From Swiss-Prot, chains A, B:
Coiled coil ranges: none
Protein's name according to its UniProt entry: Globin-1
Organism annotation: Anadara inaequivalvis (Inequivalve ark)
Signal peptide extent: none
Quaternary structure and interacting proteins, as annotated: Homodimer.
Family indicated by similarity: Belongs to the globin family.
Record's keyword annotation contains Metal-binding: yes
A Pfam match: Globin
GO molecular-function terms, A-Z: heme binding; identical protein binding; metal ion binding; oxygen binding; oxygen carrier activity
Binding residues annotated for heme b, in chain numbering: H100
Taxonomic lineage of the native organism: Eukaryota, Metazoa, Spiralia, Lophotrochozoa, Mollusca
PANTHER family the record matches: BLR2807 PROTEIN, GEO09476P1
Subcellular localization: Cytoplasm
Amino acid sequence: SVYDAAAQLTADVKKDLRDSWKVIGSDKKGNGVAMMTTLFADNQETIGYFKRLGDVSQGMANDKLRGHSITLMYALQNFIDQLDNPDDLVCVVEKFAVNHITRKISAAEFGKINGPIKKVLASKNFGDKYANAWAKLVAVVQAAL
Amino acid sequence: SVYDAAAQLTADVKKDLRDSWKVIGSDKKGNGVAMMTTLFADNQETIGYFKRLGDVSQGMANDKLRGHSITLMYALQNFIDQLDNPDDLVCVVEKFAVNHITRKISAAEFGKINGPIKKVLASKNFGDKYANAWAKLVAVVQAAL
Ligand code: HEM
Ligand code: HEM
């Protein structure tokens, strides 16, 4: 249940999400592309889904990948801004869930983003505590897939 | 080209866009839904395109419409944040252009959003000068359709 999952976002989890987002959200282009390239490097089997983006190995030089990556960060910004109201968080989560359901992305495969997030956070000196907080937010989307 | 349309946006236009966005972008849920409901009220012929959202006459109560409306405002937030780097603005614009090209939305049809934007701006006392500024930003997307 997406609603039960959303209920897991306690006061402490919400603060950790906001505190870490202040840092990684300040450079959407840089961190967005970093998240994507890490996903492709650590999980080669997912590259097939991103056929439209072309040669993703080009990274920042790939205009489609850069546009996609920046936009992905605004999806996260959206989630963060909705933390105060669970009903609004749920409706935006289900909107993006549909974007992935149509792409045939399962909850299990969506969860492969946790690795990349953990690594990007770690590069900015945010440890497991923060990685786990983000895993709970990702879990809300997983519940809708 | 899209780059040409983007590179054209002058300092004064960007100033008006950012000044007005500070206000209408401060209540994404409220103004986003207002924009969509106005589009449906003034251009009833577009309702059919949004059948995935269900009964759009439900307004704020429609969770799918609310989720869509909030997300649409983040696309605009994205545009506004990229104003000073045409290269980044172009790649995000082309990303969203694809979202509409796949739905068979022509440049002319996409321009129907200007009416609703003008009205929402006016509700906050931003006159024609501001509506014209926004029409220029919308024109950047039209250059990609
Ligand atoms: C934090 C997690 C993630 C977020 C916030 C997210 C967000 C997004 C957004 C906003 C889009 C664009 C939707 C559209 O315009 O159609 C997108 C597209 C896509 N996402 Fe994700 N995504 C995430 C994780 C993943 C993962 C882990 C996979 C794959 C294993 C995935 C696969 C896709 C695919 C295939 C597309 C379509 C790309 C295209 O052809 O343009 N996403 N995602
Ligand atoms: C300020 C201008 C506009 C912006 C920034 C915008 C933004 C968006 C965004 C972000 C999406 C979601 C893309 C996806 O997840 O697939 C969307 C979907 C859509 N847009 Fe727009 N849009 C605008 C104007 C229009 C206009 C004027 C029309 C039609 C005359 C239109 C028709 C559509 C349709 C049919 C969808 C699909 C809705 C669905 O089934 O979920 N858009 N738009």
